[PDB]
Write a protein that binds this ligand. Structure first.
Ligand SMILES: Nc1ncnc2c1ncn2[C@@H]1O[C@H](COP(=O)(O)OP(=O)(O)OP(=O)(O)O)[C@@H](O)[C@H]1O
Ligand SMILES: Nc1ncnc2c1ncn2[C@@H]1O[C@H](COP(=O)(O)OP(=O)(O)OP(=O)(O)O)[C@@H](O)[C@H]1O
Ligand SMILES: Nc1ncnc2c1ncn2[C@@H]1O[C@H](COP(=O)(O)OP(=O)(O)O)[C@@H](O)[C@H]1O
Ligand SMILES: [Mg+2]
Ligand SMILES: [Mg+2]
Ligand SMILES: [Mg+2]
Lengths: 315, 470, 51, 578, 193, 193
């Protein structure tokens, strides 16, 4: 397929750069930036006008210039390729496998932002999930379609609780009387801002018991670029929604640390240069968090379900 | 010679002059108007079409038709000489004593060049300031940066004048006896009033201490740029004297809070964004270029010692100016309002005061060898006494044991005799004798921190031997 | 009883009040920094750009 | 490279026109003198540079010449036994040509260009090479410095220089495509050096301090943080780690230090000796020194240069320990740099990307398999200085999230002259389970049980503090009094350590294990004697208590006989009782 | 438009003892119920929708959860109108704009709801209007003013925030309609500080 | 201009026990009395004007109430001078610029008053100068600076505020006049934070 490149760079400062004659670049489009040395970066159009278009860079702007730099269009809307063979694989939160296995062949390409659910099309949650913890399963039992976070602390073992819940989660159809046939169960594990030791602990914990055969892992490290941390939970939610609402899976989504996500959002939000919120966090953080949490639930006339267990440490 | 007449904009402390691309950055210029009055100025921005000049003093008589600008010097320089001892200056080098101006041996830039870290050496010699609470427990070492923290109504100027009047070195106690060491004092005042100016002049001129001192005095109504440039001239003179003529110098900065406020005003006038609590973000760097000019250099005999003085704005140690000062300096000396209100002078409270470099400058071969243990014992006993004093107010004096009463009497006698020395001049031997006389109130063997040899040699002297002149 | 009450009640409340006041002051400082940035940006918009 | 002229000077910011083709974050030589700066904004035909030095005296129209490369460090032979600033300038070679001051615009080279090195090639013509392998060896003090091909270079070997005496500028290997490989290469300080695979740490980082390597150990390749208030003992502990660690190469970084405190380490270090071979200590260390008066750009990039050097020494198969003194003063430099850029500061005035930089510095450590097939490790220990002593500072909370050890210092123990003033209640370590297999093969099979018993004994004393606050220690029962006195014995005989003593400054594993064994044996015998029933006052009078107290100060090679005598002396004293 | 406004003199029976006895609200009054998350604003508003004596209930879900809207969509047809005996959903009008929907539509939902409530008032009915959260409307106004590069007053809110709230709450009250009958509108808005 | 400054060695008697005893002020010194509204700055300054031992009193009402000026204009002619015996109004000069007067004239009144006080100093008198509020002068300087589109200081004040306040307070003191006599000016300023 043909490609178009724009060489009208006129201003580079901080995370932003201006492209002059980019009238055909749609708002929110995903672009890639190639320099003289051949290294390719990524970006997104945050403002397009008649005189110039504004593109922010996903990583640092070291090595960029106003002569050899060119900007090309990748796709109008950011998408991810999904498949049923992604169970048992590990990814870096952007779509690149890290387990050393050959890459998957996509069946569909889905936008990562999704679409809001129609409130008429929803139905009430009415069935529970056994987690193996008495204080949870008896007093505060988790319901299929609920979003129930875990408020933790600095010295408290939130990671061990997350691993135990991921290992021990199951759905029991024998207590419902609807037949003891198999209801497929999957776990989506998204971790962002995770150190190397915690990465090794999570990988060993998932590999030891054998729960990796029914799980998809998205792992974002602390030294990774801050845009991958922002994009990490959306890909996991897209995969979970695809599995649940196209293959009748009962999926469970665990977000390891929302505090790192909020830190990354505060870091990114300085490019727009707006008036900050309560403690330096952006004033649109409620909407940004609502675009993530409100993707779980159950749909009338469908068998699947999406359940979320966010985990955050209170400062 | 060449005069620029392309003035295009005058507003406040700034004026723009066109066709001035030949002016260097940071240069000094003279502004001349139609009435013949000449003002000074500094270039703060140079562009391809106009230059920006900040003007000392007001701009009342200027107009866009008759004003002209001429160049004085590309770099602000000072002419130093050994004949500057015994003279007074206004902070930019102009004498204010009526004597003829001095002839310079050399002209040096007032901006400083950083010392090579591999060229310095560890300080090892003490300075006797004549104050027991500083000489004994917070010893000042040649090459140390030891600031003084004061309040609003506390008498910091009296302490500064007393230290500058009583400072001396003691070569007879160092090593074998050594040789004569020249000593000088450089005094810098920033943003002082007429009363403090008169007090400083009267204090310096009444005892002959002016013959070994250089004065840089800046008034409160003087332009703020002169307040900015005031400490750098003094430090240039101190560096010249120390590292070109083997002088042991002592530098006293009277008020760094005025310097910080002047820096804030200059930064606001030059259209810059402030940082924490309205202060400029580069204040840590600017303060570091002043404090770190002191020390001693390997291969040289001279030294530079700094005693900065600053006032906490609301008796708060979390204010940026005292907080950043402690990040650079080697301790602090804190004055007390409680001791001041009780009639004790000087009101130095030893509990929060601390000198980091004390251990190097004391011990055998340099002052008496029992210094450290005596200071530690005094600190511990005073710490016990200040708690027994407040326990007395609740439980009464007869509900304690006898040793708590001894500690309380020690605390009272300490505050009455050691700290409250008045306008005396005490040698290190006199201070040590008074300290040992205060330790005789405590029972023998209760002094855990002192070895038995010093206890055997020095314990037993009555306190009432100071009753000839307490 | 007095020691326990002082150590468990009053001090955490005073500490929380101090924390709240510090947060409010920091927010005010951030707002005034934003205002100064905006007025500087408006300052450069006329003298350095217009004819 | 691109050359331009000065258009406008407004302090440390200089606008240069005609700089089309220049790249972002490149190094420029500003003016006739040659002051260095960084390009921070490109706009049309003009570029915005930020001069590091003082810009007074510059004039409009002076030339500006770019170098075309970002901030980099020269990696090669001759870095050991060297003193550098934050931007890798040799301070000793600057003094020889300038004097006691550092004049602006002085030009020096990081690696000496006139010293001859013995060359021993390992490759032969016709070989196929890739990035990271070994081309030859060079003798440097007690080490054999390996010459590595740069990581991004691959090709076929054409010509190899024979053995002889060559400088660092001689091209030793020239490839088939015309590329010439020398003894040194340049690497940007902000780019992590690639490796093959990261491994789990399994060997302890021996420190020489008893409480550090016994109660809260750190594995070789992990990260640790030591925060504390003023006077707690951070600097003494850091230089003790410099003196007594078992690491092959030590890198010491000082950011924003005071002049006299920097002079202390710069003076004492040449007088010390290496504990392993007995040679000079400076033969294994690389020093980076920055007092408060070099410019803020060199102070901010000090930790990245040191971590880049440590990563370079890791790629040769060594084990490197990196200590960064007072990273809180690096945070101040970062805050000042962000303030000069008007970057909308976050809480407490720090920029919002402080945590990202702190994570990028601390995540370069670990035990890896190098590109040359060898195993290396980097251990990072960082010191934090909170402003008021509170651990709620953003720097402390950002450091707490990623480190694997936390050696918290307390001001209460510092007041009572209890050194090291390490709060054992508030400290933790996440490496005990990993090093548990290693302890039972090199020290003793029952070492973890002894450590757990010591920790339990310390925990039992802390639960009795509310009892001794009401009534006196003598009013307690004998069973509780025994644990109180044994806790005092532990605190004053095992945790306490003097850094300035001749023999107490260094303590090995077996000596601490023997001390713990003696303490536990005394506790068991005292419990048995209490069970039979004696007064606790007679137990505390026993003169064997002196032997445990003096066990700290007995030297290393006299300790086994002392321990053997004390082990039977405890029993002999306890049988001779009621 | 209306002819006259009258003094409210009949209670608005909420069916809750503490609200009906200690802190009553009239047939033409306004009330505010602030509180943190998980305190009981939504349960109180839904109980007011279920059990009050109002003829027509208008519910505005401005920026809240969609499950709370599906609850009303599902359970209400099963219940019974307290004063007519028919289904409860036959007297209820629902305006929904969840938290993942576009932000700018939050203000329009509030204005549409209050306009519908005023329309049902002119026919002689007694209408109870419930807003789920008025803080999300302020957030939307803050975002719109931030896009307009305006100068914020306090915490990013535009200086004209109080005028909009005053204009919204002033539409309630007992009136004499242009047709001559009597009608009233009650507003109970919830605040999430 | 003057010939020579002098050291302060004579107290300025005010008639208030606490100020005269605990916190004395010299004849050529300066004093400041800040406080919130309703604390008694104006009453203290008027008592100082009534009962001090100064020969000439100059009162400057920078941006304050006109009722206080009416009080001074009415009560003072009926009072008795402590050291002369005549009316108290025969030694007093009033400069009045009330709060509803134009803003730009607030700065000029302080300079006019201090210039008159300096003029009476040159004749050998001892002059007491009272400033009603310098905070009004600072607020006027802030108000004028908004029209110039400047970048201000900490709380919106112009950066040259500290220079004007310093230059105003350095005009006080005991001097030797050009005519060979001896006079002094003492300034008491009030701050309204
Ligand atoms: N009157 C009540 N009787 C019984 N349970 C109640 C009552 N009020 C509240 N609850 C309980 O408390 C919970 C509070 O949920 P609710 O939706 O009312 O909270 P909210 O104040 O609207 O919070 P949010 O701001 O998070 O939406 C209910 O789900 C229910 O479990
Ligand atoms: N010395 C005093 N003796 C008796 N009453 C006094 C005294 N000082 C003040 N008051 C009373 O307190 C009131 C304070 O009013 P005053 O005009 O002095 O306020 P102010 O501090 O000058 O305030 P503002 O800043 O609003 O001008 C007086 O009107 C009087 O009633
Ligand atoms: N292990 C130790 N043995 C003996 N003295 C110590 C020890 N640790 C700290 N000290 C004392 O505590 C003081 C701590 O100061 P220093 O470590 O230089 O700075 P800071 O503790 O503020 O980082 C030192 O002066 C030293 O004398
Ligand atoms: Mg230290
Ligand atoms: Mg709710
Ligand atoms: Mg008043």
């Amino acid at each position: 397929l043909l490609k178009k490149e724009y060489t009208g760079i006129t201003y580079i400062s901080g995370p932003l750069l201006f492209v002059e004659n980019a009238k055909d670049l749609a708002y929110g489009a995903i672009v890639d930036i190639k320099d003289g040395t051949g290294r390719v970066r990524g970006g997104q159009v945050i403002e397009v006008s008649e005189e110039y278009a504004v593109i922010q860079v996903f990583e640092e702007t070291t090595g960029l210039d106003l002569a050899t730099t060119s900007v090309s269009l990748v796709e109008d809307v950011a998408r991810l390729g999904v498949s049923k063979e992604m169970l048992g694989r590990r990814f870096n939160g952007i779509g690149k496998p890290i387990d050393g296995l050959p890459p998957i062949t996509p069946e569909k390409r889905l936008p990562i932002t999704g679409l809001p659910l129609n409130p008429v099309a929803r139905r009430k949650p009415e069935q529970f999930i056994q987690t193996g913890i008495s204080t949870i399963d008896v007093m505060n039992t988790l319901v299929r379609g609920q979003k129930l976070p875990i408020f933790s602390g600095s010295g408290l073992p939130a990671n061990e609780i997350a691993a135990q819940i991921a290992r021990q989660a199951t759905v029991r159809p024998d207590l419902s009387g609807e037949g003891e046939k198999e209801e497929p169960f999957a776990v989506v594990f998204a971790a962002m801002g995770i150190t190397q030791r915690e990465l090794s602990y999570f990988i060993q914990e998932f590999e030891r018991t054998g729960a990796l055969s029914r799980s998809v892992l998205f792992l974002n490290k602390a030294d990774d670029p801050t845009i991958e941390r922002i994009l990490t939970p959306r890909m996991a939610l897209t995969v979970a929604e695809y599995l649940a609402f196209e293959h009748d899976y009962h999926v469970l989504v665990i977000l390891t640390d929302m505090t790192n996500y909020c830190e990354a959002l505060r870091e990114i939000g300085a490019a727009r240069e707006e008036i900050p919120g309560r403690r330096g966090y952006p004033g649109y953080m409620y909407t940004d968090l609502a675009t993530i949490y409100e993707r779980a639930g159950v749909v009338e006339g469908k068998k699947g379900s999406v359940t979320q267990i966010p985990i955050l440490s209170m400062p | 010679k060449k005069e620029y007449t392309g003035i295009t904009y005058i507003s406040g402390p700034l004026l723009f002059v066109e066709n001035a691309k030949d002016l260097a950055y940071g240069a000094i210029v003279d502004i001349k108007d139609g009435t013949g009055r000449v003002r000074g100025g500094q270039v703060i921005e140079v562009s391809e079409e106009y230059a920006v000049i900040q003007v000392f003093e007001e701009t009342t008589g200027l107009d866009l038709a008759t004003t002209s600008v001429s160049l004085v010097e590309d770099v602000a320089r000072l002419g130093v000489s050994k004949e500057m001892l015994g003279r007074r200056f206004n902070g930019i080098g102009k004498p204010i004593d009526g004597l003829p101006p001095i002839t310079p041996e050399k002209r040096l830039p007032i901006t400083g060049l950083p010392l090579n870290p591999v060229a310095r050496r560890k300080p090892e010699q003490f300075i006797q300031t004549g104050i027991s609470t500083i000489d004994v427990m917070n010893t000042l070492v040649r090459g140390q940066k030891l600031p003084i923290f004061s309040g609003s109504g506390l008498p910091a100027n009296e302490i500064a004048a007393q230290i500058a009047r009583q400072a001396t070195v003691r070569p007879d106690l160092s090593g074998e006896g050594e040789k004569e060491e020249p000593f000088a004092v450089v005094f810098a005042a920033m943003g002082i009033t007429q009363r403090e100016l008169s007090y400083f002049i009267q204090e310096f001129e009444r005892t002959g201490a002016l013959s070994r001192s250089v004065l840089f005095l800046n008034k409160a109504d003087d332009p703020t740029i002169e307040r900015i440039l005031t400490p750098r001239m003094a430090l240039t003179v101190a560096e010249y004297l120390a590292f070109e003529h083997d002088y042991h110098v002592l530098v006293i900065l009277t008020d760094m809070t005025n310097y910080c406020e002047a820096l804030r005003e200059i930064g606001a006038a030059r259209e810059e964004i402030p940082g924490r609590r309205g202060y400029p973000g580069y204040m840590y760097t600017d303060l570091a270029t002043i404090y770190e000019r002191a020390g001693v250099v390997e291969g040289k005999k001279g030294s530079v010692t700094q005693i900065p003085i600053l006032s906490m704005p609301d008796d708060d140690r979390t204010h940026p100016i005292p907080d950043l000062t402690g990040y650079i300096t080697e301790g602090q000396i804190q004055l007390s309002r409680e001791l001041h209100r009780k009639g004790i002078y000087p009101p130095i409270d030893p509990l929060p005061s601390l000198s980091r470099l004390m251990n190097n400058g004391v011990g055998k071969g340099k002052t008496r060898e029992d210094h450290k243990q005596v200071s530690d014992q005094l600190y511990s006993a005073y710490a016990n006494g200040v708690d027994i004093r407040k326990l007395v107010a609740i439980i009464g004096e007869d509900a304690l044991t006898e040793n708590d009463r001894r500690y309380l009497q020690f605390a009272d006698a300490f505050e009455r005799f050691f700290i409250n020395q008045g306008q005396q001049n005490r040698s290190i031997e006199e201070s040590l004798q008074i300290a040992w006389a205060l330790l005789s109130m405590l029972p023998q063997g209760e002094l855990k921190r002192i070895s038995k040899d010093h206890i055997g040699k020095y314990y037993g002297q009555k306190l009432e031997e100071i009753w000839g002149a307490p | 009883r007095r020691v326990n009450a002082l150590e468990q009640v009053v001090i955490p409340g005073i500490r929380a009040q101090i924390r709240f006041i510090q947060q409010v002051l920091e927010q005010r400082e951030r707002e005034d920094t934003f205002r100064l940035k905006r007025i500087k940006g408006k300052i450069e918009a006329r003298e350095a750009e217009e004819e | 490279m691109i050359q331009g002229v000065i258009q406008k000077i407004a302090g440390p910011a200089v606008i240069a026109k005609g700089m089309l083709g220049a790249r972002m974050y490149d190094i420029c030589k500003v003016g006739e003198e040659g002051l260095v700066g960084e390009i921070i904004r490109l706009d049309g035909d003009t570029a915005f540079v930020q001069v590091y030095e003082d810009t007074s005296g510059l004039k409009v129209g002076e030339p500006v010449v770019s170098t075309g490369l970002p901030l980099a460090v020269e990696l090669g032979p001759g870095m050991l036994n060297g003193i550098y600033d934050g931007i890798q300038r040799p301070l000793e070679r600057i003094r020889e040509k300038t004097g006691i001051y550092i004049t602006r615009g002085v030009v020096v080279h990081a690696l000496d260009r006139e010293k001859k090195w013995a060359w021993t090639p390992m490759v032969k013509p016709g070989d196929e090479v890739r990035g990271g392998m070994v081309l030859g060896t060079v003798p440097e003090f007690g080490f054999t410095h390996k010459i590595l091909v740069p990581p991004d270079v691959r090709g076929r070997v054409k010509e190899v220089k024979p053995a002889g005496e060559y400088t660092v500028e001689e091209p030793v290997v020239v490839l088939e495509d015309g590329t010439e490989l020398k003894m040194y290469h340049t690497w940007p300080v902000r780019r992590a050096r690639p490796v093959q695979r990261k491994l789990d740490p399994n060997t302890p980082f021996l420190t020489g301090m008893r409480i550090l390597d016994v109660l809260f150990p750190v594995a070789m390749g992990g990260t640790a943080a030591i925060p504390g208030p003023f006077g707690s003992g951070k600097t003494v502990t850091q230089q003790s780690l410099a003196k007594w660690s078992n690491a092959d190469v030590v890198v010491y970084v000082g950011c924003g230090e005071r002049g006299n405190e920097m002079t202390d380490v710069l003076v004492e270090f040449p007088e010390l000796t290496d504990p392993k071979t007995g040679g000079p200590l400076m033969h294994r260390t690389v020093l980076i020194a920055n007092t408060s008066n070099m410019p803020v750009a060199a102070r901010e990039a000090s930790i990245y240069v040191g971590v880049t050097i440590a990563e370079y020494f890791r790629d040769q198969g060594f084990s490197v320990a990196l200590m960064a003194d007072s990273t809180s003063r690096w945070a101040e430099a970062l805050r000042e740099i962000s303030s000069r850029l008007e970057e909308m500061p976050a809480e407490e005035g720090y920029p919002p990307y402080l945590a990202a930089r702190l994570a990028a510095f601390y995540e370069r450590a670990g035990k890896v398999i190098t590109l040359g097939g060898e195993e290396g490790a980097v251990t990072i220990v960082g010191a934090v200085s909170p402003p008021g002593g509170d651990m709620s500072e953003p720097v402390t909370q950002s450091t707490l999230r990623i480190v694997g050890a936390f050696w918290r210092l307390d001001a209460s123990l510092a007041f009572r002259r209890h050194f090291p003033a390490i709060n054992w209640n508030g400290s933790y370590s996440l490496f005990t389970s990993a090093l548990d297999p290693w302890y039972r093969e090199n020290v003793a099979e029952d070492y973890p049980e002894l450590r757990d018993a010591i920790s339990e004994l310390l925990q039992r004393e802390a639960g009795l503090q509310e009892i001794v606050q009401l009534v006196g220690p003598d009013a307690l029962q004998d069973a509780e009094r025994l644990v109180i006195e044994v806790g005092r014995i532990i605190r004053e005989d095992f945790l306490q350590q003097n850094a300035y003593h001749e023999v107490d400054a260094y303590c090995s594993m077996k000596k601490a294990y023997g001390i713990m064994k003696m303490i536990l044996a005394f506790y068991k015998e005292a419990e048995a004697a209490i069970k039979r029933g004696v007064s606790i006052d007679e137990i505390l009078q026993l003169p064997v208590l002196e032997r445990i107290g003096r066990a700290r100060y007995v030297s290393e090679e006299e300790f086994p006989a002392y321990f053997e005598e004390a082990m039977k002396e405890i029993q002999g004293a306890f049988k001779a009782l009621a």
